[PDB]
Design a binder for this molecule. Structure first.
Ligand SMILES: Cc1cc(-c2nc(Cl)cn2Cc2ccccc2)cn(C)c1=O
Length: 113
């Protein structure tokens, strides 16, 4: 009912959309933590100090970790920023990040007041 609750509902809706089949073609690299060892990315954790992914965001939302929309958005944007920091800008995963961030930013902007 309250403002914080209402804004977190909007955030949860966005999260559900980002994890939905509608966006799966470009969202899937963000579903789980980057497994650096599995992907042969042995410099990943030297470059990315604070990894983030949608499963972690989901766990935090479920645990009521996020106190407001701003805190939620910071994690989603951290996830994208990590991608832009680590990967050359012409790489496929970056194109996918850009597309998912477009989904995120446009819906996040429709936050209720
Ligand atoms: C460096 C990096 C790898 C992945 C990743 N996760 C899976 Cl599972 C496969 N990959 C590699 C990939 C290669 C080509 C296209 C998409 C992902 C995801 N993110 C966000 C990254 O920053």
């Amino acid at each position: 009912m309250g403002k914080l609750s209402e804004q977190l509902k909007h955030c949860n809706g966005i999260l559900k959309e980002l994890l939905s089949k509608k966006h799966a073609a470009y969202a899937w690299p963000f579903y789980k933590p980057v497994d650096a060892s599995a992907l042969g990315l042995h410099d990943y954790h030297d470059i990315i100090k604070h990894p983030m992914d949608l499963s972690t965001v989901k766990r935090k939302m479920e645990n009521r970790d996020y106190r407001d929309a701003q805190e939620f958005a910071a994690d989603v944007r951290l996830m994208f920023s990590n991608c832009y920091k680590y990967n050359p800008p012409d790489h496929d995963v970056v194109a996918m990040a850009r597309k998912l961030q477009d989904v995120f930013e446009f819906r996040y902007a429709k936050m209720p007041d």
